[PDB]
Design a protein around this ligand. Structure first.
Ligand SMILES: CNC(=O)C(C)(C)C
Length: 116
């Protein structure tokens, strides 16, 4: 509360570390469905169903332009990518499988990087 500060983690390297994690995501062989925004003019249903589209290139742009206030808002957008993917794709499809794989990949790197 007022004048009662918790000791808080050193967040000075967060931007660099999130960029490193995003780079590993971008270079994963299963990243291809997520590299660019879904084309809302070519994919029936997507605009109406997926209320907040997100993709790696959009995350990279927001990261590079100071649009994430903190590391949690970055993680929310990454997770949004895979939550959208689950909403629109069957688990037993290539993109569906890609999404689950990429989510798993992200969450381990997230834990390994920031959860001490
Ligand atoms: C991530 N891509 C998708 O979810 C499709 C709309 C199926 C192309």
């Amino acid at each position: 509360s007022m004048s009662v500060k918790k000791p808080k983690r050193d967040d000075s390297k967060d931007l660099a570390l999130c960029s490193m994690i995003l780079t590993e995501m971008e270079t994963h062989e299963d990243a291809w469905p997520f590299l660019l925004p879904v084309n809302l003019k070519l994919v029936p249903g997507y605009k109406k169903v997926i209320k907040k589209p997100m993709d790696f290139s959009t995350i990279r742009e927001k990261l590079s332009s100071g649009q994430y206030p903190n590391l949690e808002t970055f993680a929310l957008d990454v997770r949004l990518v895979f939550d959208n993917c689950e909403t629109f794709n069957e688990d037993d499809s290539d993109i569906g499988r890609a999404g689950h794989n990429m989510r798993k990949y992200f969450e381990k790197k997230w834990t390994d990087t920031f959860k001490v």
